[PDB]
């Protein structure tokens, strides 16, 4: 059952597709096929290769009008190191003055970043519960809890210069708050002076852990 269109998806459109590296790449939608319970989308990548993909593994090659995205929306966004890569995630906050009109993204591996309105792309056919295709179960479970509770977001008030313990990979590290940016805090780990931007409601921050573990 070949199709030339699926709603707004049309054969020949520009698209992003997910590769097995989990990075996303520009290409062209070359076929739509009904296969079992749904549709498959064949993508020819600009650089190298052809993939047959599910609808949650393609994204539009345009930056959406900001108001079409919501907390919980499934997106691909720019993830910088240094490169620039496109990686999937979930919108955690929409643009407001307090965040300098940026989107907060929680990526599928648990990385967090603010991105601009021109640095994200909507996934075409996400799952209704958008987090159900997140492979990392700890990130999946976190996003379900976060989106379900939203707009209830307990956070710690931190100030530049404040010393706290911050968790990383099973150890609690002496650290310092360097900067606050909206719902993120830039933490300097004192043992090596590398930083990490962490959500101010994350229980990786000792004050937030302390509050959530009290009862």
């Amino acid at each position: 059952g070949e199709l030339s269109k699926d709603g707004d998806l049309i054969v020949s459109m520009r698209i992003l597709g997910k590769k097995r590296t989990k990075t996303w790449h520009k290409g062209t939608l070359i076929a739509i096929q009904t296969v079992g319970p749904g549709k498959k989308y064949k993508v020819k990548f600009d650089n190298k290769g052809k993939s047959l993909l599910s609808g949650n593994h393609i994204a539009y090659d345009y930056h959406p009008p900001a108001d079409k995205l919501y907390v919980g929306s499934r997106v691909v966004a720019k993830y910088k190191d240094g490169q620039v890569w496109l990686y999937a995630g979930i919108v955690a906050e929409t643009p407001n003055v307090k965040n300098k009109l940026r989107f907060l993204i929680f990526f599928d591996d648990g990385y967090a970043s603010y991105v601009t309105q021109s640095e994200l792309y909507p996934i075409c056919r996400p799952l209704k519960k958008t987090w159900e295709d997140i492979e990392d179960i700890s990130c999946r479970d976190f996003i379900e809890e976060y989106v379900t509770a939203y707009p209830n977001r307990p956070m710690v008030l931190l100030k530049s210069g404040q010393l706290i313990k911050t968790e990383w990979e099973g150890t609690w590290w002496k650290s310092r708050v360097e900067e606050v940016d909206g719902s993120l805090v830039r933490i300097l780990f004192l043992d090596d002076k590398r930083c990490e931007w962490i959500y101010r409601g994350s229980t990786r921050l000792e004050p937030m852990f302390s509050m959530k573990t009290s009862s």
């Binding site: 591996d109 648990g110 990130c139 968790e167 099973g170 990490e196 994350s202 229980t203 990786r204």
Partner: peptide
């Protein structure tokens, strides 16, 4: 200069 992500919650 950043570490690899520690994710959103403490490791289990």
């Amino acid at each position: 200069a950043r570490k690899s992500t520690g994710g959103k919650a403490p490791r289990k």
